[PDB]
From a paper:
Phytochromes (PHYs) are red-light sensing enzymatic switches first discovered in plants, with homologs in the photosynthetic and nonphotosynthetic bacteria. PHYs are composed of a photosensory core module (PCM) and an effector, enzymatic domain. In bacteriophytochromes (BphPs), the PCM consists of three domains named PAS (Per ARNT Sim), GAF (cGMP phosphodiesterase/adenylyl cyclase/FhIA), and PHY (phytochrome-specific GAF-related) [Fig. 1(a)].1–5 The effector domain is typically a histidine kinase, covalently linked to a PHY domain, although other nonenzymatic output domains can be found. However, both proteins bind the same bilin chromophore and share a large amino acid sequence identity (38%).5,14,18 Biliverdin (BV) is an open-chain tetrapyrrole that is highly conjugated and allows for reversible photoconversion in BphPs between the red light absorbing (Pr, λmax 700 nm) and far-red light absorbing (Pfr, λmax 750 nm) states. Here, we report three crystal structures of the SaBphP2 photosensory core module (PCM), lacking the effector histidine kinase domain.
The reported structures are of a SaBphP2 PCM in the wild-type (wt) and mutant forms determined at 1.65 Å and 2.2 Å, respectively. This is the highest resolution structure of any PCM construct in the wild-type form to date, revealing the important intricate details of the hydrogen-bonding network of the conserved amino acids and waters stabilizing BV chromophore in the Pr state. The wild-type protein crystallized in the dark in the Pr state in space group P21. Crystals grown from the PCM constructs diffracted to 1.65 Å resolution at 100 K and 2.1 Å at 293 K. Given the high resolution of SaBphP2 wild-type structure, we clearly observe an intricate network of waters and conserved amino acids which stabilize the BV-chromophore in the Pr state. 2(c) and 3(d)]. Interestingly, not a single amino acid from the PHY domain forms direct contact with the BV chromophore. Crystal structures of the wild-type classical SaBphP2 determined at the highest resolution of any PCM to date reveal an intricate network of hydrogen bonds between conserved amino acids, neighboring water molecules, and BV which all stabilize the Pr state. To our surprise, the dimer interface structure of SaBphP2 is different from those of the related classical phytochromes such as DrBphP21,50 and RpBphP2.8 They all have an extensive helical kink at the dimer interface that is absent from SaBphP2. In the SaBphP2 PCM crystals, subunits A and B form a noncrystallographic dimer.
Numbering used by the authors: 9 to 489
Amino acid sequence: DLSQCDREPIHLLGGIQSHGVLLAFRGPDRLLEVVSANAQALLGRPPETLLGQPVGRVLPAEVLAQWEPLVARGSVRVVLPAGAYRALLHESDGLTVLELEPAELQPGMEETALEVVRRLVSPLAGVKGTQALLQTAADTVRALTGFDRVMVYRFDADWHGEVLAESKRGGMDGFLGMHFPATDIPVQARALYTRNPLRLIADARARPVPLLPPVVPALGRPLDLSNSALRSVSPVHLEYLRNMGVGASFSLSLLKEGVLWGLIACHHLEPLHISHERRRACEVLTQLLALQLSAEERAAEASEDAHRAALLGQLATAMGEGGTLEEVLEKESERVLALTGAAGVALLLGEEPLLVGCTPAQDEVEALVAWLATQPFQTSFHTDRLGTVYPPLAARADVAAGILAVRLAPAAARFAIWFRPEVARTISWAGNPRKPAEPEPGHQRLHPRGSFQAWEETVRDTSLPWKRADLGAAEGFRGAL
Ligand SMILES: *C/C=C1/C(=C/C2=NC(=C\c3[nH]c(/C=C4\NC(=O)C(C=C)=C4C)c(C)c3CCC(=O)O)/C(CCC(=O)O)=C2C)NC(=O)[C@H]1C
């Protein structure tokens, strides 16, 4: 893809985090084929002397005693000499991958998790605005994880993102309202996070534990750790966290109607391990947030649609109550503009344009019509940045940053064209987005930026986006004209 940031194969880095152990077994005899270099931590023996051995001769008696439920369920609690561990199974590269990580220590964890689930599934939760929904999600995730800072991060259209809501302990700094470059979470990371919706970095300073051997022998490349809970993350990102002053990180993908909408990101100033089952409990909260957002967004759409139908009905009542069509539209200007949330409208009903509200002058409208008549757009054309595709009005963002035009005839140049002014947006970037990384000379290593301090810019010449209800209202108004 675009940048070198996009090319690092983060699922093939060949390392795991030091708090866990990984063992990959092959074939009917379950012969050990890949093992983490720290595996004496739970095997009692030097791991390289166990490659090739069958599983019953490798694993502790305690784990073997749980093999049946492990195989059947893919996840069991095992009590080892080192303490309680969560054992996890998944498949990768034709191997059965066993991961062990420290298990949840609080017996009441799930009871606590059900309580915070209540806050987010409540009778009419999200009734103070979706902002209160986002805040509740940040608060409950922080309560359940104990992380110092929890942020709701939304991806915008160009895949840069912004923090919409933040929950943090007293005294902490935060990132509320700040924007971050798309390269902060590159394309292959976004792809992985769409398929694997949870990731924990327990200690941003710890060194990775390598796998032995360093390739899957049948493949000649490292074991695919795409679905591994212990996967050590990109070194560049660990440097990013260090530059942020973050010692531990945990994030959850927000998947809303199938697409990666954002993340809930958690930061801790010191190392912090969250158990597998506590992370899965937090995943319920994030799934609930996504459901609540969808329910409220669709509710808003349905309400907006009803308002547009009502406007069309009120205009039909106004019509035929006397006067020509032109007289009615002039008198009902406010309703005609509200159909599409516009500031002005031009009607070309056969002669010169009828200009209602704030529009460009007659000359500029007539020139725009002659251009629209050449364009390919079936029945409706819309843009929120007219100046990029129609230079004659590019300096006129005071009245025509956005347009929504509908055809009123097959071949003839008869249109209704609604206009919108620009909405300037002053945004704070977390660091200078003109320097989103610090590459070494030669451009072969790359480091993250050193500074996340606010850097201000104002986005101009773009209107509010045209909503689905705006487009439907315009289609429905065509029949009246
Ligand atoms: C040239 C490449 C760069 C780069 C690579 C990179 N970042 C990755 C993971 C990642 N980044 C973020 C970003 C944020 N964390 C926050 O708190 C905020 C806003 C407040 C942002 C924008 C996150 C959340 C993550 C996921 C991991 C986590 O900590 O939760 C990855 C993938 C790491 C992996 O192996 O999974 C890569 C490759 N970051 C850059 O800045 C440039 C230099």
